[PDB]
């Protein structure tokens, strides 16, 4: 047994499933994309696409 806990906050979960949903809140809202080839990060899946082709 134990406690499925955030660790980042360490102070919150609604449940184990609650924590699972809550765990992703620290990735943040996805208004960006990470590069397939070199993993550089750009403010959209558009700026990333421009970066991708002229790599
Ligand atoms: Zn948290
Ligand atoms: Zn790249």
Structure description:
There is one protein chain. The protein has two helices and two strands. With 55 residues, the chain is of the alpha+beta class. The protein has a single domain (1-55), classed as Classic Zinc Finger (Double Stranded RNA Binding Domain, 2-Layer Sandwich), CATH 3.30.160. It has a two-stranded antiparallel sheet with strand order 1-2. The longest helix has 8 residues, at 16-23. The protein starts with 15 loop residues before the first helix and ends with a helix. The structure holds zinc ion (2 copies). Residues 35, 37-38, 40, 51, 55 line the site of one zinc ion. Homodimer. Interacts with EBF1. Interacts with SMAD1 and SMAD4. Interacts with PARP1. Interacts with CEP290. A zinc finger (C2H2-type) spans 4-26, 33-55.
Topology:
Blueprint: H1 16-23, E1 33-34, E2 41-42, H2 47-53
Antiparallel strand pairs: 1-2
Bound molecules: zinc ion (ZN) (2 copies).
One zinc ion is lined by residues 35, 37-38, 40, 51, 55.
Total E-strand runs: 2
Using the coordinates shown, work out and report the CATH topology. Double Stranded RNA Binding Domain
N/C terminus separation: 49 Å
Q: How many domains comprise the coordinates?
A: 1
N-to-C SSE string, H for helix and E for strand:
HEEH
Beta-strand portion reads: 5-15%
Associated small molecules: zinc ion
Radius of gyration: 16 Å
Q: Reading side by side through the largest sheet, how are the strands ordered? A: 1-2
Q: Tell me the overall shape.
A: elongated
Tell me, what is the CATH class?
Alpha Beta
CATH architecture: 2-Layer Sandwich
Helix-strand category: alpha+beta
Count of separate DSSP helical elements: 2
PDB class: dna binding protein
Keywords: Structural Genomics, northeast structural genomics consortium (nesg), Target HR7298F, PSI-Biology, Protein Structure Initiative, C2H2, DNA binding protein
Assembly: monomeric
Entry title: Solution NMR Structure of Zinc finger protein 423 from Homo sapiens, Northeast Structural Genomics Consortium (NESG) Target HR7298F
């Amino acid at each position: 047994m134990g406690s499925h806990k955030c660790n980042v906050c360490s102070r919150t979960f609604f449940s184990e499933n609650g924590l699972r949903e809550h765990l992703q809140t620290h990735r943040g809202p996805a208004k960006h994309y990470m590069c397939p080839i070199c993993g550089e990060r750009f403010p959209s899946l558009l700026t990333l696409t421009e970066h991708k082709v002229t790599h």
